Hints:
- Four copies of one chain form a homotetramer.
- Chain A is an alpha/beta fold.
- Chain A has a single domain (1-267), classed as 3-Layer(aba) Sandwich (Rossmann fold).
- Chain A is built from eight helices and seven strands; from the N terminus they run E-H-E-H-E-H-E-H-E-H-E-H-H-H-E.
- In chain A, helix 1 (19-29) crosses helix 8, helix 3 packs parallel to helix 4 (111-132) and helix 4 runs parallel beside helix 5.
- The relative contact order of chain A is 0.15.
- The interface between A and D is large, with 40 and 41 residues.
- The complex binds nicotinamide-adenine-dinucleotide (NAD) (4 copies) and ligand 1S5 (4 copies).
- Chains A, C, D: InterPro entries: Enoyl-ACP_Rdtase_NADH, Mycobact_enoyl-ACP_red, NAD(P)-bd_dom_sf, SDR_fam.
- Chains A, C, D: This is Enoyl-[acyl-carrier-protein] reductase [NADH].
Amino acid sequence: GLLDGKRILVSGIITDSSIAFHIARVAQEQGAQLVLTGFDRLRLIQRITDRLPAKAPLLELDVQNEEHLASLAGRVTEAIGAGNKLDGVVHSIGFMPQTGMGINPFFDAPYADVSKGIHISAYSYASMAKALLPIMNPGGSIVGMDFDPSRAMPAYNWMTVAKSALESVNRFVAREAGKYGVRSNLVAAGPIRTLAMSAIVGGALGEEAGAQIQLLEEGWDQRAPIGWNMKDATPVAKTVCALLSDWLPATTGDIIYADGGAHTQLL
Amino acid sequence: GLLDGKRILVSGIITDSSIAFHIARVAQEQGAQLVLTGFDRLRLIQRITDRLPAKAPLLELDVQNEEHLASLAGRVTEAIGAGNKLDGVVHSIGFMPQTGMGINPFFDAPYADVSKGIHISAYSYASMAKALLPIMNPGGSIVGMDFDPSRAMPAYNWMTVAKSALESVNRFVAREAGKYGVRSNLVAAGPIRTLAMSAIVGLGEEAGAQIQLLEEGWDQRAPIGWNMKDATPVAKTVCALLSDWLPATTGDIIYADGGAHTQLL
Amino acid sequence: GLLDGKRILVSGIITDSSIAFHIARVAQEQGAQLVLTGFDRLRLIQRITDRLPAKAPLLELDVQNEEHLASLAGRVTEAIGAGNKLDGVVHSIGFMPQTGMGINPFFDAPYADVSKGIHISAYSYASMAKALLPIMNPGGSIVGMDFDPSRAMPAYNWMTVAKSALESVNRFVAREAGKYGVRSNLVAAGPIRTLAMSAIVGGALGEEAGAQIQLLEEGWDQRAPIGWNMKDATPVAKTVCALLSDWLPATTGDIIYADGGAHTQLL
Amino acid sequence: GLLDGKRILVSGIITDSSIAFHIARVAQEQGAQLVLTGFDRLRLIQRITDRLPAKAPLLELDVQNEEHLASLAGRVTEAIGAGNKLDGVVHSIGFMPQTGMGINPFFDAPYADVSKGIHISAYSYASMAKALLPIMNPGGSIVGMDFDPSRAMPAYNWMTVAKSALESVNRFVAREAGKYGVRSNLVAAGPIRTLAMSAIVGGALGEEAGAQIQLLEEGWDQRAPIGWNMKDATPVAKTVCALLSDWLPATTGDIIYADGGAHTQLL
Ligand SMILES: NC(=O)c1ccc[n+]([C@@H]2O[C@H](COP(=O)([O-])OP(=O)(O)OC[C@H]3O[C@@H](n4cnc5c(N)ncnc54)[C@H](O)[C@@H]3O)[C@@H](O)[C@H]2O)c1
Ligand SMILES: NC(=O)c1ccc[n+]([C@@H]2O[C@H](COP(=O)([O-])OP(=O)(O)OC[C@H]3O[C@@H](n4cnc5c(N)ncnc54)[C@H](O)[C@@H]3O)[C@@H](O)[C@H]2O)c1
Ligand SMILES: NC(=O)c1ccc[n+]([C@@H]2O[C@H](COP(=O)([O-])OP(=O)(O)OC[C@H]3O[C@@H](n4cnc5c(N)ncnc54)[C@H](O)[C@@H]3O)[C@@H](O)[C@H]2O)c1
Ligand SMILES: NC(=O)c1ccc[n+]([C@@H]2O[C@H](COP(=O)([O-])OP(=O)(O)OC[C@H]3O[C@@H](n4cnc5c(N)ncnc54)[C@H](O)[C@@H]3O)[C@@H](O)[C@H]2O)c1
Ligand SMILES: CCCCCCc1cc(=O)c(Oc2ccc(N)cc2C)cn1C
Ligand SMILES: CCCCCCc1cc(=O)c(Oc2ccc(N)cc2C)cn1C
Ligand SMILES: CCCCCCc1cc(=O)c(Oc2ccc(N)cc2C)cn1C
Ligand SMILES: CCCCCCc1cc(=O)c(Oc2ccc(N)cc2C)cn1C
């Protein structure tokens, strides 16, 4: 078992298509003991996580809620037992209001919406690290999910800006985490069909955005030297487990691309 | 005159050490006709801008104020005369509350503070472009100021995050600006002793020494050297982007840092 | 004139479509006094350079010829007069044997061929700097031509590797040039129709390489926020002139992109 | 056993301080069956490989020898048995003549020397993939060693240029390897005390260049959020093994940094 004996917190499960659900599944298959966190729809999330290979405690965490963050470490400790600490933390959380996405003009997104998106998608990586580092073991690993924002693209709009901010946040979280002997890294995944952008991807919220996204997906598989399957989150989940393991011990503040190699190819 | 006959808006002047003051000075020396914008202390800003080579109208602009942004294009047009449009726009605006800077712990900056910083330092680049693109001529140029955030570093903390956001915003503003025949670019400057240098050492008496060490280190790393007391090479670079001489460059970052970012030691 | 009173050496003219021909034309329009260097077909190059706005001396330079490089500074000095130095140098020189490009398999290019391409396309940037720095004025500028090699692509093959090497060479030339108060930079241009790859671009050396290149060009103009005209070298020439001027005085070891903004956009 | 049942070729062992020695040791600890290749000093190499946890066959391979490369796959097959194929290949091979490094001026390295260095350090990554891909299993992995050349630095000089070329070569090897269902990646390590470059360091002793090197090397530990120990190759060896495993299945054409996170930090 790649993660035998390791205690890992996984946030971000909302459906069985969630990248976090697959991370959790693979982690448990590899021997990890999990604590899960969920947002807003905890009754539904509980039914979904009951389908994981092993039973895991589910805790509520809205990353915009200061009370939730202040009590998190205490709640986790109660879940894993006094005297035990975490070895891993997975941040698989993102949101950008519709005004900041799709066919909505880039200039028309009010700052209040953009600010909410950046709070949830980027700042929360730092606040979860702040909350959880005091209960992590040395040798531990924090991993977040990125979508390569180094270039602009249609439809992704303000979420691209939030991911640029997240990459920067990760480099600073690494500085803090290193004081605890903990690594911090992002996995930059290729596009996966999940609930988050399903309405935009399907064309429901503007045919143009749907068409642009189809072009992006087709080009991604084309450019990836080993191809890319947008319906299979397993390669991404495996990569996250690699970073949670002891086998990338000198990598921190960094981004590991689980994208079929697409970002390394122009055409 | 590199910018002869060009009408250019320059934001960001607060003292005669401001990068924006030197941009304005060099632009005027090169024949540009300017409109200036200032934040908050407009009477004091007027006294500062009187030190420029030529007179220029000064307009109030708080980039967090939606009323200011909605009226800006109209106020500019009254300043430059009906029928006339801008050829250039300079965004030289930044702020991050002290909780997000210096020796204050990275984790202790509340989101309200970080969000204000991002609003002023990154989102406002898009806000300005939205307000002014409708009164810009084809061939025009929008330029903002950047400090290379590709790697983390001490003290710069959350402003680094805001600059990472700004670089992303710039790539999207370029998509919009291109529809108008306008380019959008950032100049990533080396460190300059402006009023804002005090923001990164907000420490004790060690501040002066730390700044002196920064200058020593940057000048060593830069293959052509670096003088933190001299904003002129940065100002010239901004003027190059405002000119007709980089006509195929957009969404991009020009480094005016003495070449330091290309060297490891 | 942007370059009034400046003495500038321009290498790399072979036809009137050469990027160097347009650099030369624009520089002369901006008041520069030129010295030109040409390779192999000097009688033909002389006829071509006679069509420039002003007369300029033409010197022979094969960058693989040690005797040519050893005598170059003295020949330039004779051309511009004793007591006078250069303010600028433009390297617009490239070559990669056909085995290293197009439909020819990447693995099948013999090292002898790849080595020749790297010699001419990358090492010679250092060779020319070595020869000419001793006769350059402080405030001077060396500029070479790059095609962004940060990602792999079809057909460009080993020339991509040579450009990666050239970018690295440029960073080291900057260190040396700095001692003389001279800047060194590359301009990464978008694709321009010139003699160099004309046979491959036309499909004459393999239809698939022609097809791949057409796709690359179509995509380039599409992504470029201000568009891209592959038949117009003028924007690239202007950019080189900007770097030769006094207006980018703090930029060195660097790469300026004159590509319509295409490299900043994914799609 | 991370590499249980995998058959892996490891090149580049010359001393028990070689990065390749540590890669081989860790791979064997994780259940891999190895074939080793050595250059020039085969009697010494055999004595050294006797220090590994398990016996592995040693084959001669000079990457500049076309006959060695032509016969390599047949020799490997005889070593692992007909019907069996490789799951992994490690390229841990590098060389740049002294003229191209250290206190020797950058401009004084003759191209003959630079070309040799680029042949061994960059082109041979493609040569080895060409020779071995036909006997690799799908799901397989090729890994090479890189030293981040994105910025210039004192002393490393023309080796930096060779590594820039290598990174470009890796992106093209990934295109070819993908046709076989094989991944290709580099690990960019922080500085390790392997005895490589001892002659370069020795020439720089007490000089400015020597001081520069010590400042540069020690810069990794300063900048690395988790620190960096130049005396310990194990974290690098582990990272290579992670890439050889099934746990980074969507990463190709890419660079993994095993440098303590130093490259993500400016100071
Ligand atoms: N799907 C892709 O193609 C892709 C590619 C690269 C990166 N990512 C990133 O991967 C992560 C997971 O995305 P996904 O595709 O699995 O979509 P998803 O919808 O299945 O998961 C996103 C999660 O964010 C959670 N969330 C939203 N607001 C929250 C809040 N205030 N507090 C706590 N949690 C909150 C949601 O409840 C949900 O569980 C995100 O960071 C996303 O940006 C997705
Ligand atoms: N000084 C450096 O070393 C350096 C290096 C690279 C980039 N920069 C950037 O250059 C730009 C100018 O900085 P500077 O060094 O000249 O400092 P400065 O203090 O002289 O200028 C900063 C400007 O931001 C303006 N500003 C703050 N809040 C505003 C608001 N709500 N609305 C409108 N304007 C507002 C200030 O009033 C001021 O005029 C900034 O973007 C800064 O981040 C500075
Ligand atoms: N055309 C494009 O799209 C494009 C895009 C980006 C960069 N570039 C680069 O721009 C430069 C000029 O290319 P071009 O497109 O004008 O093609 P070109 O054929 O018009 O010019 C290439 C020059 O290299 C010269 N050359 C070849 N071997 C030489 C040697 N041994 N010694 C001296 N000179 C030698 C040729 O004689 C010729 O004058 C090259 O470095 C090329 O790689 C071209
Ligand atoms: N030591 C470091 O700090 C460091 C850091 C990053 C990357 N690297 C890279 O790691 C790899 C291994 O280097 P090392 O430090 O273990 O030094 P090393 O001397 O122990 O290994 C280098 C290997 O290259 C082999 N080699 C040289 N010419 C050859 C040829 N013609 N044919 C076949 N093999 C040949 C040598 O025989 C030797 O075994 C190299 O690519 C090096 O550049 C080293
Ligand atoms: C134009 C880009 C197409 C590929 C996008 C890949 C991609 C990147 C994503 O970051 C993503 O996740 C979100 C996006 C938005 C919101 N509100 C919430 C989430 C969790 C989904 N997907 C699918
Ligand atoms: C570790 C070295 C960092 C050097 C930073 C250079 C630098 C970069 C800057 O972005 C900057 O400007 C500000 C920063 C903060 C605020 N509130 C307002 C401003 C205008 C000043 N300086 C001087
Ligand atoms: C697949 C990429 C297509 C666009 C390539 C752009 C481009 C890049 C080039 O480097 C180029 O110049 C050469 C290329 C090869 C040789 N032997 C000599 C030269 C001078 C021409 N072109 C046109
Ligand atoms: C000046 C940079 C200091 C840190 C360099 C790290 C480093 C990088 C290396 O690429 C390296 O390996 C060689 C270098 C040259 C040759 N001929 C052969 C080899 C195997 C050793 N080291 C130690």
